[model samples]
Target: DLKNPYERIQAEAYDAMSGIQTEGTDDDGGGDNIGWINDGDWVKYERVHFERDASSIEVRVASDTPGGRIEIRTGSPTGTLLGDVQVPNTGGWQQWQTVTGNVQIQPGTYDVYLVFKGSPEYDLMNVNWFVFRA
Candidate 1:
């Protein structure tokens, strides 16, 4: 269903990535392939029309490093900040954990951007999917 967390715009939808495809290497327990994410990478999801503004956001991610963060932006990369969820090391690639951040938005359509930031020399994390909550 569309309300599911994995139902949202996924990381594999991005044009750029080390390996931009669903992989069975590490399953997130939901049977969905994971999106391998790198530092300084950004993915865009277009035309997310919201009848009501979202108040929070949740994401399923896996990481083996600390201090990585996912920035949720609307309309543009430099658009309004919706949320910034921290990524914690989950031991393994397939080890998934859900993290949520608070956001304030108004009813409108937007082109959402998921910007990943982490260590300069290594990959940050992997994203299963994300969702915006009303």
Candidate 2:
């Protein structure tokens, strides 16, 4: 027996993102949020993730202190609204909370618009956008 295990490689498009998509709504808004982060003291950005095999949604807001301006939509970077979930942070960017919502269909991209509320003010910087796989 070996001390470690190995998994065969599978050829899937999204299986491995060797490249990065640099154009879109600019979820970061400003460059500083995405790639220009030199410090980690100001309004930090984060995302809570979840997935569902059924079609339903029910959860609570995860942030407070400075409710973020947010949105929920069903679309991928390809601009397709297959499914969407709008969220507003009521507390602050401190923890990941429970996000509930069943996929409207089988499986695809469901964008959780982590629309920062106080951009340029409290400076809601989005450097932690995530794509959760179920």
Candidate 3:
């Protein structure tokens, strides 16, 4: 978890628009957790301060569809492309998995965006949390 002893953030909660929230609950034995995004949907974690430069990012995610992708960007949706991770289907919505992508970034505060990409018929994935590691 980004909320780890030495971690900065795990995940930022949000509404479909203009609301800062985290966690949701689902009937699939889980809810009040993670962020869900479709194509063109994104959440911006504002003013994240990193005590040290991070070389990798880890995201906890779940998807029932293949081809789900998450694009990690800095500043804005069109901002710098730090890295991207492909999500694998875990059979159910509540099923979870962890994936990591690497990037070279300096220590500083930044607004980060987790952008989801996938087929219109299927959701990109459910993001349980994400964290940066040194």
Candidate 4:
């Protein structure tokens, strides 16, 4: 269960995705990251157990372009909105940074969704991992 202080989840561990891909990452944790995100792209994590209410979310992301926002939701990509984090250009796609956003999520098991929103013509951002904080 995702309880207590925080729960760190790898973005590439998504059970389902639309218009997204995974690639090698050079972040603190050496693992593959979800990338090639664009407007309307989304990734889903199944059976995410949250033992307590989450107040915020942190996403480790990177981008060479201007970047965009990531919407956190439950159930489906168009489901209940938790919050959104604005990603910024990090010089390069491998230059990672942890970006945060305020959220309000009750304790429960859910199918979490990370929805991308950005310029339709360009890839939005690359996500290494994300965390939910109580």
Model 3 whole-model lDDT (C-alpha atoms): 0.66
Q: Estimated TM-score per prediction? A: 0.78, 0.31, 0.77, 0.94
> Which parts of model 3 are misplaced by more than 4 Å?
1-8, 12-31
Q: Who is ahead in TM-score, 1 or 2?
A: 1
Q: Give the alpha carbon lDDT tens digit for every residue of 1-134 in model 2.
A: 11100111111112112112221222222221121111111221112223344354332333433333322333322333334343345344433343543434344333332222243444332232333324
Can you write out model 1's per-residue Cα lDDT over 9-104, one digit (the tens) per residue?
Answer: 555554333333466535534545445566766777766667777888888787776638888887666777877888888886777878888877
| Candidate 4 off by > 4 Å | 1-5
TM-score (C-alpha, index-matched) for candidate 3? 0.77
Better of 1 and 4 by lDDT: 4
Please, what are the lDDT tens digits per residue for candidate 3 over residues 1-134? 12231352445443222222345644243445454556767777766677777788887777767747878777778899878888888777667777888866677777777777778776667776677788
Q: Which is superior by lDDT, 2 or 3?
A: 3
Writing each residue's lDDT as its tens digit, candidate 4 over 71-99 gives 99988889989889999999889999999
lDDT of 4 at 104: 93
Candidate 2 deviant stretches above 4 angstroms = 1-76, 107-134
Lowest lDDT 10-residue stretch of candidate 1: 1-10
* lDDT (C-alpha, whole model) for all candidates: 0.69, 0.29, 0.66, 0.89
